[PDB]
Symmetry: C3
Subunit: 117 residues, 3 copies
């Protein structure tokens, strides 16, 4: 089957180093939890809240050996009033046979309050 | 195959109870029209126009029993001139066999004009 | 498997006649290069940088024969300091047996500079 994996993380500053570090760390954690290999990945979508401008989060994928052919595009998360600020989210679509209810979705930094289930 | 099921609806005011009620009603209808099982849904995207700020349309998914582990995420619709105001659109990806031309895509409220 | 194909192009002006023309061109080249049939497409997402408001690029899909039931939707590409301007991007999800490293992603117009290793 092919399924989606969700991740979320936050930076303390809209700085290219912290966006890339914190996105790469999110990506690593998902891959680790989900045993994901680059050729299992259909595509990835990364969103930033409307207050991060330094760099596109997807540049962090280029710091993962083997991931040069995984499709990615970024997007503006909608501007909700009360939304967790300075947040990056990933929806990674993967060829997998693990059941829906057993996929591991990662939530790091201040994002751990988004989905505490 | 896996295929996507498009939907769109419009709220009449930007407030949580309103956004979530109209998003949940769109989803119940998509699930109804295509007889969708949560375990059949790869992922779902929900976009709102930049004039809606009260709540993520996504939170409405959790009102559909059985849908907790379905991966949903929102994004913003681009502001297009002569665009439908206060509109919420979904792209749901389900594993299915029903031909492309027979997928039942759903447009509700003023979004019937899309 | 189902794999993602990627495209990007740029318009010179924010006019409907241009967003729809550059988006038709970009979709043709991807369909061509990858032999994509409309019934192999799972869905498509198109993003545009926040400086394009003339039209939704998904309307160009309608200009392609047989592409009438392919799901499309758009989103705002995040605004990045030094991002390529007036740019449209396509993430076309398709069912293909072609392998990852042979999928042809097609970058056109000023977008040639975004991923030059493809
Ligand atoms: O269109 C593109 O190809 C480029 C590359 C990019 C990436 O970092 O991988 C991927 C998606 C877009 O958000 C940006 C960043 O532009
Ligand atoms: O990243 C997230 O997981 C959270 C939860 C959310 C939901 O309401 O389900 C789903 C998608 C995101 O757009 C928002 C809303 O943040
Ligand atoms: O919801 C819709 O169906 C309509 C039509 C549209 C298009 O231009 O084809 C397709 C996708 C949406 O993002 C917009 C534009 O609204």
């Amino acid at each position: 089957m092919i399924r989606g994996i969700r991740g979320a993380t936050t930076v303390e500053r809209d700085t290219e180093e912290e966006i890339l570090q914190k996105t790469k760390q999110l990506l690593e954690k998902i891959i680790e939890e989900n045993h994901t290999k680059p050729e299992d990945v259909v595509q990835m979508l990364l969103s930033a809240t409307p207050d991060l401008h330094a760099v596109f989060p997807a540049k962090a994928v280029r710091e993962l050996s083997g991931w040069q052919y995984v499709p990615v595009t970024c997007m503006q998360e909608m501007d909700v009033t009360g939304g967790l600020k300075k947040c990056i989210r990933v929806m990674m679509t993967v060829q997998t046979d693990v059941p829906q209810d057993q996929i591991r979705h990662v939530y790091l930094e201040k994002a751990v309050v988004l989905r505490p289930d």
